[PDB]
Design a protein around this ligand. Structure first.
Ligand code: MZ6
Lengths: 99, 99
């Protein structure tokens, strides 16, 4: 599909049996999700943006479904105000910028 | 052009006869540039990102040529971690997400 940018590029994602709205974000290196208690091992990390840094938990090899497309990779979990699908997963679902 | 996302979508922009590198950032509502001088009146503004809120200077009706495509619109100047082109200008240059 094609998504114009008049509004925020929010789409439905699925991780386990939680469905969430998340930004398709070309400015995000990594995928950052709102606080959720995912199973398995993780590592602490700090990521920076406008306003400074937040602390996140890095979970690896998490399957995630984005608009019916299958992805699997690293997801950072922490106190972000919005769910952010970053480039690590955008490539997996075949996402490009075009103009 | 078509831009893939295995690397950061950094492009050369021209603003005030100056060449800068900026990130095409679909998760950003606004276009935010690192500290620089621009002519004319500005308004104090505050914006929020992943790490909290910052103060920026709001310049309106500023021409920027992004990867050869002309835009004229609002540019915020302040302590962003990197120059970002947000949706306000991405729409002007006809940028869409496709997968
Ligand atoms: C450095 C370039 C940018 C600012 C990085 N950010 C992505 C950017 O699209 C973020 C995404 C976002 C949206 C809404 C609330 C919080 C965050 N956008 C913004 O900061 C933003 C948003 C609205 C208006 C505005 O002027 C700026 S990010 O801070 O969210 C981010 C995301 C993923 C990531 N992975 C490693 S560092 C890192 C930082």
């Amino acid at each position: 599909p094609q998504i114009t940018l008049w509004k925020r590029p929010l789409v439905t994602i699925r991780i386990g049996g939680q469905l969430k709205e998340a930004l398709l974000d070309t400015g995000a290196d990594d995928t950052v999700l709102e606080e959720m208690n995912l199973p398995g091992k993780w590592k602490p990390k700090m990521i920076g943006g406008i306003g400074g840094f937040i602390k996140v938990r890095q979970y690896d090899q998490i399957p995630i479904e984005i608009c019916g497309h299958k992805a699997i990779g690293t997801v950072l979990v922490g106190p972000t105000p919005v769910n952010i699908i970053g480039r690590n997963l955008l490539t997996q679902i075949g996402c490009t910028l075009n103009f």
